Amino acid sequence: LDVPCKVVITAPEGEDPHPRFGKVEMSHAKHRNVSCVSCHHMFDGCGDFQKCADCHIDRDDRSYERGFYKAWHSESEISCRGCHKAMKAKNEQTGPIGCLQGCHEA
Amino acid sequence: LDVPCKVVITAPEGEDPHPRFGKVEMSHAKHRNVSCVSCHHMFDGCGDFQKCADCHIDRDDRSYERGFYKAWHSESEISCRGCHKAMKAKNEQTGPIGCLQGCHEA
Ligand code: HEC
Ligand code: HEC
Ligand code: HEC
Ligand code: HEC
Ligand code: HEC
Ligand code: HEC
Ligand code: HEC
Ligand code: HEC
């Protein structure tokens, strides 16, 4: 499909991930009310799509804004956890925040 | 997915173009502040961004809401001319409205 309904997000090739943190499912359908650029923040209205880890490569420095970990966990509202925390602070229905809740579960 | 930065819109596949109004270019780049669903009104969450004339096929009149002409020229703000006219009425920066301005121009 042009936009797959569910995606499986993994670590890039290289260092195996911690066994409990290696794959996360995300649904584009559940995020239908979130604009593409809210997540695909480098999309400027046309062009094609990459994996986030085509840029968010570094796995060793979890503080680095352009690294792998911060793509998903930064306080930035671009990140999975950052948006969900910001929405929760607004009492808005949103996604999970706990480390083994939802994303890293099941 | 590759969202073309410029598309050339013409008659439905396999059909002959209008002899004077046959092709119109549209820039996704220029429309980057317009949500995808504002035009692709059948897209919901995930799936395909279909060409409009997959559905807007009829050219027997310029009145049928599901036909070709109304996709582009309708009071509806989903249509090219309808959105531009509505935005102009609100004194918002927008696209062209005259029949030979922009869309059906060099
Ligand atoms: C955050 C909630 C997102 C929204 C809103 C949209 N997308 Fe998305 N998309 C997101 C992720 C995290 C992923 C997986 C990327 C990875 O590195 O694993 C995707 C994936 C896609 C893809 C496939 C890219 C690929 O793996 O090659 C496409 C083509 C895509 N997304 C398109 C897209 C569009 C057009 C959106 C708005 C309608 C959109 N996405 C929203 C996260 C999010
Ligand atoms: C390269 C073309 C990139 C792709 C694809 C994705 N990101 Fe990105 N991201 C990139 C850069 C260069 C930067 C720094 C800001 C800038 O534009 O220069 C970022 C930043 C983020 C952030 C902010 C992190 C922080 O400041 O703490 C997040 C949360 C982030 N990126 C997430 C993210 C996701 C989820 C992506 C796939 C959907 C993604 N990025 C793609 C470069 C690139
Ligand atoms: C805001 C800009 C978001 C970003 C970035 C991400 N998510 Fe999200 N998420 C958001 C909303 C508004 C919602 C609620 C949708 C609703 O109306 O119900 C969600 C929800 C989720 C869920 C729960 C879905 C379900 O089945 O109930 C998950 C598991 C989830 N979000 C995951 C997720 C991931 C992995 C993201 C980064 C790739 C991510 N979200 C980004 C808003 C936003
Ligand atoms: C969804 C909103 C998430 C929540 C909540 C948390 N994490 Fe996450 N994490 C998420 C994604 C989309 C990804 C990328 C895909 C993958 O599983 O690798 C990750 C990744 C990690 C990793 C792996 C890092 C690496 O291998 O380099 C770890 C160790 C990790 N996540 C830990 C973690 C912790 C401690 C959390 C609470 C602060 C947490 N995650 C929440 C998405 C989401
Ligand atoms: C109206 C101003 C639009 C906005 C906003 C977006 N798109 Fe669009 N797109 C539009 C048209 C009129 C066309 C040409 C269709 C035709 O019938 O000729 C397109 C085309 C696409 C395509 C390509 C489809 C194909 O050629 O088969 C894609 C993948 C696409 N559009 C995606 C897309 C996305 C993801 C948008 C939001 C970021 C988006 N479009 C906005 C009109 C408009
Ligand atoms: C079939 C899957 C369709 C595609 C692809 C597109 N449109 Fe559509 N359109 C469709 C229907 C069934 C209808 C009627 C209303 C409904 O939702 O049932 C419409 C309507 C419009 C209109 C309104 C016309 C009017 O009432 O005068 C416009 C302006 C319109 N559609 C435009 C449009 C464009 C520009 C598309 C490609 C980007 C497009 N439609 C695709 C069915 C389908
Ligand atoms: C509102 C929901 C729109 C619809 C539907 C379409 N257009 Fe549009 N258009 C819109 C805006 C807000 C703007 C201004 C962008 C800016 O900030 O400058 C425009 C602009 C144009 C232009 C001028 C720019 C250019 O590409 O040369 C053209 C020629 C144009 N729009 C064409 C066009 C066509 C062909 C559409 C239907 C397929 C269409 N627009 C829809 C807002 C909206
Ligand atoms: C962009 C905002 C437009 C303006 C202003 C006008 N038209 Fe248009 N027209 C537009 C598109 C995107 C298309 C589809 C592609 C194509 O060129 O075929 C059209 C099409 C027509 C047609 C052809 C119909 C057919 O069955 O082939 C005609 C005759 C036409 N347009 C006429 C027309 C007139 C009279 C306008 C002023 C009221 C007008 N158009 C404005 C986009 C845009």
Coordinates of C-alpha atoms and ligand atoms in Angstrom, one line a residue, chain A residues 9-11 17 21-24 59 62 68-69 72-73 80-81 84 96-99 101 103-104, ligand 4:
Chain A
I9 CA 9.9 -0.9 13.8
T10 CA 13.2 -2.7 14.5
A11 CA 16.8 -1.9 15.3
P17 CA 18.9 -5.2 20.6
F21 CA 13.2 -3.9 23.3
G22 CA 13.8 -5.1 19.8
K23 CA 10.5 -4.6 17.9
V24 CA 7.7 -2.1 18.2
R59 CA 23.0 3.4 18.9
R62 CA 21.3 7.8 23.7
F68 CA 18.6 6.0 17.1
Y69 CA 17.2 6.2 20.7
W72 CA 11.5 7.3 19.6
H73 CA 12.1 8.6 23.2
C80 CA 6.8 8.5 20.1
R81 CA 7.2 9.0 23.8
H84 CA 2.4 10.9 24.0
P96 CA 1.6 4.7 25.8
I97 CA 4.5 6.1 27.9
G98 CA 5.7 3.4 30.3
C99 CA 8.8 1.6 29.2
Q101 CA 3.6 -0.6 28.4
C103 CA 5.3 -0.3 22.6
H104 CA 7.6 -2.8 24.3
Ligands
HEC4 C1 6.4 3.8 22.3 C2 5.6 5.1 22.5 C3 7.6 3.6 23.1 C4 7.7 3.7 24.5 C5 6.7 4.1 25.5 C6 9.1 3.3 24.8 N1 9.8 3.0 23.7 FE1 11.6 2.2 23.5 N2 11.5 2.1 21.6 C7 10.4 2.5 20.8 C8 10.7 2.3 19.4 C9 9.7 2.6 18.3 C10 11.9 1.8 19.3 C11 12.7 1.4 18.1 C12 12.5 0.0 17.6 C13 13.2 -1.0 18.5 O1 12.4 -1.7 19.3 O2 14.4 -1.1 18.6 C14 12.4 1.7 20.6 C15 13.6 1.2 21.0 C16 14.1 1.0 22.3 C17 15.4 0.4 22.7 C18 16.4 -0.1 21.7 C19 17.6 0.8 21.5 C20 18.7 0.1 20.6 O3 18.6 -1.1 20.3 O4 19.6 0.9 20.3 C21 15.4 0.4 24.0 C22 16.5 -0.2 24.9 C23 14.2 1.1 24.5 N3 13.4 1.4 23.4 C24 14.0 1.4 25.8 C25 12.9 2.0 26.3 C26 12.7 2.5 27.7 C27 13.7 2.3 28.8 C28 11.5 3.1 27.7 C29 10.9 3.9 28.9 C30 11.7 5.2 29.1 C31 10.9 3.0 26.4 N4 11.8 2.4 25.5 C32 9.6 3.4 26.1 C33 9.2 3.0 21.3 C34 8.9 3.2 22.6

